[PDB]
Every structure is written in structure tokens, then in C-alpha cells.
Design a protein around this ligand. Structure first.
Ligand SMILES: CC(=O)N[C@@H]1[C@@H](O)[C@H](O)[C@@H](CO)O[C@H]1O
Ligand SMILES: *[C@@H]1O[C@H](CO)[C@@H](O)[C@H](O)[C@H]1NC(C)=O
Lengths: 48, 49
């Protein structure tokens, strides 16, 4: 929900640790036009 | 690969990415009916979630 994003030549990156990662508030919103995974699935993220 | 793959690719080979539950041993599922992953019902060929 931030205002400005970095470029793809200088792509931003955030370290995540010391939190609980609730995907329900994220993934169950139609505001995303794409969501596609490569070693995991949306129906099991919160169990990982 | 040498008999079975193709230069732009072969794409006939479906697997299944979803199911309400695990299948029983030596079960075969041919159903292709849309997987309602979200809380919304979802008739028609696709939807969000
Ligand atoms: C899993 C499977 O066999 N699906 C086929 C489908 O691709 C085909 O369009 C239909 C034609 O009747 O027969 C069935
Ligand atoms: C069999 O079909 C019923 C009704 O749709 C369902 O409750 C059950 O989970 C299915 N079992 C398997 C192994 O697919």
C-alpha cells in the first residue's frame, strides 16, 4: 500500500523475519490481477 | 525427451494442481470442473481465486 515503487533495473527488496505472515488478508482480495506460484500453492501457504 | 518432447514444446501432458481432498490409492480423477479455491462460488470457465 506504499505510494512509490523502485524500478526493475534497481528492484527493491525487504527482509522478512520475526512476524506471522497472514495470507488471508492478502490473497483473498480480487485487487490482484496475477498470483502464480512455483514451489507452493495459495491453499497451503499459511501451513508452511 | 528425444521421442516425446517437441521443439516449441509439447503441452498435451496435464497434471492436476488442485483437489478438495487427497485421492485414495489407485484412484483416477477425470473431472475438470472448476476448483472454487476462494469463499465465492464460481460457475463459468474461470474466476479470481
Ligand atoms: C479428460 C478427457 O478425456 N476429456 C475429454 C475432453 O477433452 C473432450 O473435449 C471430450 C469430448 O467429448 O471428451 C472428454
Ligand atoms: C467422493 O465424492 C463425494 C461427493 O462429491 C465426496 O464427498 C468425497 O470426498 C469423494 N471422495 C473421493 C476419494 O474423491
Amino acid at each position: 500500500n506504499a505510494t512509490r515503487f523502485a524500478s526493475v533495473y534497481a528492484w527493491n527488496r525487504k527482509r522478512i523475519s520475526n512476524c506471522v505472515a497472514d495470507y488471508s488478508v492478502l490473497y483473498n482480495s480480487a485487487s490482484f490481477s496475477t498470483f502464480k506460484c512455483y514451489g507452493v500453492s495459495p491453499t497451503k501457504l499459511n501451513d508452511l | 525427451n528425444n521421442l516425446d518432447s517437441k521443439v516449441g514444446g509439447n503441452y498435451n501432458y496435464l497434471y492436476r494442481l488442485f483437489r478438495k481432498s487427497n485421492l485414495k490409492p489407485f484412484e483416477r480423477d477425470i473431472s475438470t470442473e472448476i476448483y472454487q479455491a476462494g469463499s465465492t462460488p464460481c460457475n463459468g470457465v474461470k474466476g479470481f481465486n
